[PDB]
Structures are given as C-alpha cells and as structure tokens.
C-alpha cells in the first residue's frame, strides 16, 4: 500500500535575543540510511524580516514554506504593502497547518524575527497548527538531544546561585549574538556526534532591524 | 493535562497546568491552557493542543459576532453550545477536546459548562478534565465547601493542580489561576511547580511521601 509520507531527517534550532533572533538548521537531507544532499537548505528568508523552517517530511516542508511565502505576497497586495508582523505570520501559519488537519503536513515548523517592539521572537508549531512563542526551541530529528541543553544554557534551568543553599535561582538575562552563535554551533556539533541524520553543514540565519544575515559552518560528514 | 473549575460563594475559580506532551516527550512546560474569550468568559483546554487552541479561538470570534449582531454579550449557555454543536458535526472524525466554558452573565450568574469532543455538554458546579483529573478531584472534593473564601478557594484550586502535577506524569510545568466574579475574570498569576511544590511542602507539612 502506498505511503504518502517520508522522513528527510535533519534538525533545526531557534533562539531569540533582546534585539535579534537566530534560526539555524543543518544542510543534510536523507532517506533511510542514504544521504540525498550534503547541502540542501531548509531555513528560508520569507520577507518582512521573517525566517522560517519546516522540518520533517521535506515535500510537506517545501509546500508549506511555498504557501506561506505566497501568503506574505498576497498580504501586501490586499493590505497596502503593510508589513506582516511575526505574531500575524504565526496565526496565519496555524490556519495553513490546521487546514490539513485530516491529512497533515508532516513537519515541525519554527519561525523567527522581531516583534512589534523590536525584540527578538521565536514561534514554534506542531504538525497540525498548535503554536506558542518562546525564547528557545529545537525541532526535528535531534530535537530531543538539543532542547534540554537549551533549557539549561538559555533559560538557566536547574542552575542556582552558588552558596545560596539552592534557594536563589540564576537570574534570567538576554544573550549577545556572539554567545547565541556559540550555543548554536556547540548544539549542532553535539547533535552531529550522536545522531546519524545530522551533519554535513550548518546554516544560521540571523535577524536584526538591519535585515537578514547568513553564516555557514562545516559539520562532520560521516 | 489537568484542568479544573468550580463554583462557590464568591464566584468561580479556574485552575490549569501548563504541560504539553508527545508520548513520553515533554514538549512544553509553558502552554497557555486558559483562553480569554472576553472580559467575562474563559475557556479551558485539554486533549489535542491544536484542536483546543484552534476551535476555542474560533469560538471567541463567534462570541464577538454575537455581541455585534445582538448588541449584548453572549450567554455562557449559548457560547458553550456553539462549541458543542461544532464538535458534534465533526463527531467520528477524530477531534480530541475536553473543555470547560466558564463565565458570568446577569441572567445566568456564575456558570460552568463541560464540553467534549464526543458531543457531551453538561452544566455543573465542579469539573476536573484531563489525564490528571482524578488526582485533582481527590484533593478538590475532599476540601470543597460552598462557603470557601476567595483566598481559600484560590489556594484549593492551586493545590489541586499541584497534586495532579505531582502524581500525573503528563501534568506539570506551572499553575495558572483565574477568579471569575460579577465584574469579570481576574488573573491570579503563573506559579511554577519547581518552587511551588517545596513552598507548599514546607508551609503545609504535606507531601511526606517525598524525600525532604
């Protein structure tokens, strides 16, 4: 019997700072135990300072990104070139996903950008459109490896102030773009070590008020 | 999930946890399971995250259209029935929802309706919904009186979620409290179980099963 779904592997990661946000993802694409491509990007600039990635089944991922990019285009046509805010994009993506509730897009979606106060924003979705804004989210095959590391290093979970008898928590603070990229690179090298579907290359898209910048780093190719 | 809402002398208390799970994987500890429909109406979420979130925000839009058309805030009965009739149309298609529509109007007073995805709609004073509902019932039922003060009622709702958060593996994160009066709903904060458990243990002397 024909199975309309597949698994293209890979993993993605979004972190938000005070005046910026990053959305990273490895460039490997797989089926079963074979590599399809060592460089097939899945993090995209969708316009209006919104970056997006839909990781899982690549065909569904591409279809969704394609439809959202198109949604941004028609938002301009219908509402006098108004900028689509990250919160409005998030709600729009929910309806794209839930529209196929009974034949779902097999993807974990993450978008990143700046909110209307200029502060960094990351939104994450389940396959059928449930969404939530967070400081931090990892998605895809190695999400279970990376996410707990992010809880510990971004949100300072389980970390207390030394000498305070485990009474005072380590205070929350925004991270610099330099510190965030360090965590992204370490997260992906760790995930590459212990997950077979993750490797080859890392592509990070950084979003500030000035625009979208890209950075690329090599990952292990085994 | 564990969600509850109960009626009492001073209105309605609504309390929920904040955990989302995909099998045994803890997906989120910060989910908003109460939706603020209007200043006098609340909705609780249990079951499918997307199903609940999507259709309860849709419900909010239907309630807004009612007050535009009828120049009057929708009743709790009518609001709950819009949702129950909606899910009944989808019966068998596989929607998963356990919701509670809580609010105040002049004609009804404080009112709670239980609505679920197989079409059940029930008016009642006390309900607990979710995988940890039984744990919440155990504490809530054994301490409930109609004559509870606003202060005590808030604590009991908080304490009942904490009980379920502790025992139910698929409940946890933090407690979100709400109080519904004749003047509308009032938010009573987000309470992390990480700190709340130890604070309650020490001050109350309960949770003796746990290594102190």
């Amino acid at each position: 019997q024909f199975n309309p779904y597949g698994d293209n592997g890979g993993t993605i990661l979004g972190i938000a700072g005070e005046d910026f946000a990053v959305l990273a993802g490895d460039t490997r694409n797989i089926t079963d135990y074979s590599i399809n491509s060592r460089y097939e990007p899945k993090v995209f600039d969708c316009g209006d300072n919104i970056v997006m990635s839909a990781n899982g089944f690549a065909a569904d991922g591409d279809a969704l990104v394609k439809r959202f990019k198109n949604s941004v285009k028609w938002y301009h046509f219908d509402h006098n070139d108004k900028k689509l805010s990250i919160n409005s994009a998030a709600r729009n993506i929910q309806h794209l996903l839930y529209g196929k509730r009974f034949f779902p897009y097999y993807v974990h979606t993450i978008i990143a950008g700046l909110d209307e106060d200029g502060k960094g924003a990351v939104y994450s979705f389940d396959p059928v459109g449930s969404y939530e804004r967070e400081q931090c989210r990892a998605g895809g095959a190695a999400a279970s490896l990376i996410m707990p590391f992010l809880d510990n290093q971004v949100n300072f979970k389980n970390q207390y102030e030394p000498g305070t008898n485990g009474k005072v928590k380590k205070p929350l603070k925004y991270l610099s773009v330099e510190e965030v990229i360090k965590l992204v690179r370490d997260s992906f090298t760790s995930a590459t070590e212990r997950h077979i579907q993750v490797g080859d290359g890392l592509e990070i898209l950084i979003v500030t008020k000035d625009g979208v910048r890209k950075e690329f780093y090599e990952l292990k190719r085994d | 999930t564990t969600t509850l809402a109960f009626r009492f002398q001073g209105g309605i208390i609504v309390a929920v946890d904040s955990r989302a799970t995909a099998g045994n994987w803890v997906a989120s500890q910060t989910v908003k399971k109460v939706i603020e429909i209007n200043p006098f109406l609340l909705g609780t979420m249990a079951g499918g995250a997307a199903d609940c979130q999507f259709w309860e925000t849709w419900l909010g839009s239907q309630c807004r259209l009612h007050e535009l058309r009828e120049k009057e805030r929708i009743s709790v009965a009518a609001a709950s029935k819009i949702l129950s009739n909606l899910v009944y149309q989808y019966k068998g298609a596989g929607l998963s929802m356990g919701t509670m529509i809580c609010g105040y109007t002049r004609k009804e007073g404080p009112t709670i309706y239980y609505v679920d995805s197989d079409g059940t709609r029930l008016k009642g004073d006390i309900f607990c919904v979710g995988s940890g509902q039984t744990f919440a019932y155990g504490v809530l039922d054994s301490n409930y009186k109609w004559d509870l003060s606003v202060e005590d009622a808030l604590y009991l709702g908080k304490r009942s979620i904490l009980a379920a958060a502790h025992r139910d593996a698929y409940s946890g994160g933090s407690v979100n409290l709400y109080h519904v009066t004749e003047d509308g709903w009032i938010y009573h904060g987000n309470h992390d179980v990480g700190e709340l458990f130890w604070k309650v243990k020490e001050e109350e002397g309960s949770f003796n099963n746990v290594i102190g």
Binding site: D126, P127, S130 | T21, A22, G48, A49, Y170
Partner: peptide
C-alpha cells in the same frame, strides 16, 4: 502532535 502534542496533547495536554
């Protein structure tokens, strides 16, 4: 997809 997650449940609650």
């Amino acid at each position: 997809a997650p449940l609650x």
